[PDB]
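Consortium newsletter contribution from the modelling node. Members have asked for a concrete example of what our holo predictions look like. Here is one, prepared for the mercury (II) ion complex that several groups have been discussing at recent meetings.
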Amino acid sequence: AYTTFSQTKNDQLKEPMFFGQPVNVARYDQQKYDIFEKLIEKQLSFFWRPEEVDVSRDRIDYQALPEHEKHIFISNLKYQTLLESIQGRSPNVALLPLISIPELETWVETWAFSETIHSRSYTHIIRNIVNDPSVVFDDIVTNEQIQKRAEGISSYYDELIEMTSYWHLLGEGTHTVNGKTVTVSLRELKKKLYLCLMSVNALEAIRFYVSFACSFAFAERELMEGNAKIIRLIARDEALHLTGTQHMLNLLRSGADDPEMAEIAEECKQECYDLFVQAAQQEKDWADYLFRDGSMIGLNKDILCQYVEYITNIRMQAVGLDLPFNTRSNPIPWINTWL
Amino acid sequence: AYTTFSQTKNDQLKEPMFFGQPVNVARYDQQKYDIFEKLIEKQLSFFWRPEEVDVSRDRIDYQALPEHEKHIFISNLKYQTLLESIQGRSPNVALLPLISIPELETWVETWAFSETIHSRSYTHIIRNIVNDPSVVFDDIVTNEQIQKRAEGISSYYDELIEMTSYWHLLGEGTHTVNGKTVTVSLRELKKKLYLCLMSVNALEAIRFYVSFACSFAFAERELMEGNAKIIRLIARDEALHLTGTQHMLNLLRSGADDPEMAEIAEECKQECYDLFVQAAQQEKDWADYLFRDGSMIGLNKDILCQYVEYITNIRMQAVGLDLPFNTRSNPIPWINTWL
Ligand SMILES: [Hg+2]
Ligand SMILES: [Hg+2]
Ligand SMILES: [Hg+2]
Ligand SMILES: [Hg+2]
Ligand SMILES: [Hg+2]
Ligand SMILES: [Hg+2]
Ligand SMILES: [Hg+2]
Ligand SMILES: [Hg+2]
Ligand SMILES: [Hg+2]
Ligand SMILES: [Hg+2]
Ligand SMILES: [Hg+2]
Ligand SMILES: [Hg+2]
Ligand SMILES: [Hg+2]
Ligand SMILES: [Hg+2]
Ligand SMILES: [Mn+2]
Ligand SMILES: [Mn+2]
Ligand SMILES: [Mn+2]
Ligand SMILES: [Mn+2]
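And here is the predicted structure:
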C-alpha cells in the first residue's frame, strides 16, 4: 500500500513524522520541524571528497607500525567500514517507506548519502595502506569478533523492514498467510521503529565515537595523518547524524507528534535502557580482541572501558534515560582536540 | 527475505546487478561494471548548491511576462518539480532492496541524492518568483493535466515495490493470503523491474529534456536567467542519470549479466516500445494545455512535438528499440548551447 506519490492533497505540516501519508511533493519552503531542514543545510555545507585527502604517507606510517599496533589500527578500521556499509543503505531502506513529512524524508536520504561517502573514504584509506584490499574487506564479513560487536544492528533493521512490508501489503489486522496466523499491529510496528531509532542513536553516538578514539590515538603519535583528517571529517558528519536521531526520539517522546509514540516511548523505556547497556557491553568485549597482541601507551582495555561508560552516560542523558554507569571525568581529554 | 548485511562472504564481482545476494560490504576498489563507479565520481564532482545561484531578477521577469507565458513557464516548472519529487525517493525505495553489487547500490543512492538537490533548487526558484509558494506546490499534487504521467510513473514503481515485498516475504511459489491465491514469480518480478527501468529511462531521457527546452526558450530571450542557470546544472546531472539507466538496460538485455532477463526483455520488446511511445505521446499532449492561451518565440505546439520525436528516436535507439518516428535533424539546434 506504499506509493511513490500519494495523490491526496494533504497538509504536510500536520502529518506525524512517521506512519502518516507517504510524502508526495518535496518542498523545502516550510516544515513541521525546521531542525531537519537545518541539518540538511548543514550536512550539505560539509560536503567533502575522500579521494582528495592526501593519504600518501599513511602507507609508510602503517608499515613501520609494530605488528600489534597494525592489528589495533586495522581491526578498528574494519569495524568502522562495517558500520558505514550498513549505515549507507539502512536509513533509506528502513525509514523511507515510513516517513510522512518532506524535511525528514530528505534528511534521511542526505544522511544515508553522507554515510556512503564515509564508506568511500575507507576504501581510499584501505587501498592506500595495504597490498590487497580484498583481505581486509573479506575479513569484515567473516571475522566473528567484528560481527560479535555489531550483533543486533542488521537484525533489528531487517525485522523492522519485514514488518513494514507486511504492514504495507496486508494492513492492520490478523491475517492468514500460507495457513499461518500473522498479526499486523501498527502499535507494534511503531514500537519496532522507535527501538530501531534508539539503536541507531547508540550506533551513531557511541559505537562510532569509541572507534574515533582508537583512530585518534595514532594521530596523537603523529601517525596515520591522512586517516586522521578523514576521521575528523567523518566525526563532523556523525555529530549531525546523532543530533538528528536525538531530536527524532525526543520529539516523539514529547507527545507533540504522534500521541501514540509518546505512550510507546514511555512504556518501552526499559527496553531503551537495555539496548544501551547491551551496546556498551559489546563495545567493551571488543577490547579483548583489539588488544589480543598487546596494547598501546594511553590505549588499552581499561581506558576503552572507561571511555565507553563515559560517553554512554552522556548519550543516554541526552535522550532522557537513567545513567547505568558511575559518573566520571573524561578518561581521554586529548580526544577533544580532534572532535 | 531482505537483509541489511548478508552474512555470507561472496564474490561481488560475479553477482548479477539485481536479485543476487544483498550487498554486504560497501567497497569501491573494484567493480563488476566500472561505469557505475565512474558515474558516482562524476556526480560527486558536479555537486552544486541551488541557493548559490542568483535568481533575484527572475521575479520581475516572471511578473512582466504575458499571462499565457506565465502559464507556460509555471506549468512546466510544476511538472519538473513533480518528477524530481518522485525521483528523489523512488530509485532508493524501488531499487535498493533488489541490488546485488556495491557500485550499483551506491550509484542509486547518489543518483537519488542528486535528485533531492534538484527538488531543493525548485523550491529556491519558486520562493523567489511567487509570493505564496503554497499555491504552486498544492497544484502539483492535484493538477489534472500534470497528474496523469505521475500516475503512470508512480504506478510502475509502486507495482515493482509491492511485488518485491511479496518476493522477500514469501519467496517464489503459489501462496494463499486471506482466502486469496497469491502467485510470486521471479520471472514476472524481473519483467516488472525491466519495465520500471525502461520507464525511468524514458523519464530521465525524454520527459526531463522536453521540459528543459521550454525553460531554455525563456533563456534565449534573456528571461528567467536564474532559472536557466539552475536548469543547466540539473541537465548536466540528468545526462549522468540517463547514462546509468542506459547501461543498466543494455547490460540486462545483452544477456551478459543475466540470461533470464535477456530472455524476458526480448519477450516484452513490443511492450517496451509501446511504453516509450506512450510517454512521448503524453509529452506531446501536454502541448494542448501548455499552449492553450497561446505560444511564444521559438516555442510552440509543433516545435515541441518535433523535438519530442527527435529526442525519442535517439533514446529508443540507444536501448535497442525500433524508431517510432520519421528521422530528421534537431528541430531546435539552439538548445545545444544549454545542453
Ligand atoms: Hg535499527
Ligand atoms: Hg533504525
Ligand atoms: Hg578506542
Ligand atoms: Hg524504547
Ligand atoms: Hg525510551
Ligand atoms: Hg570501566
Ligand atoms: Hg524503476
Ligand atoms: Hg519505474
Ligand atoms: Hg515544455
Ligand atoms: Hg518544450
Ligand atoms: Hg519490456
Ligand atoms: Hg526491450
Ligand atoms: Hg510529437
Ligand atoms: Hg511531430
Ligand atoms: Mn558515517
Ligand atoms: Mn552517521
Ligand atoms: Mn533531476
Ligand atoms: Mn535524474
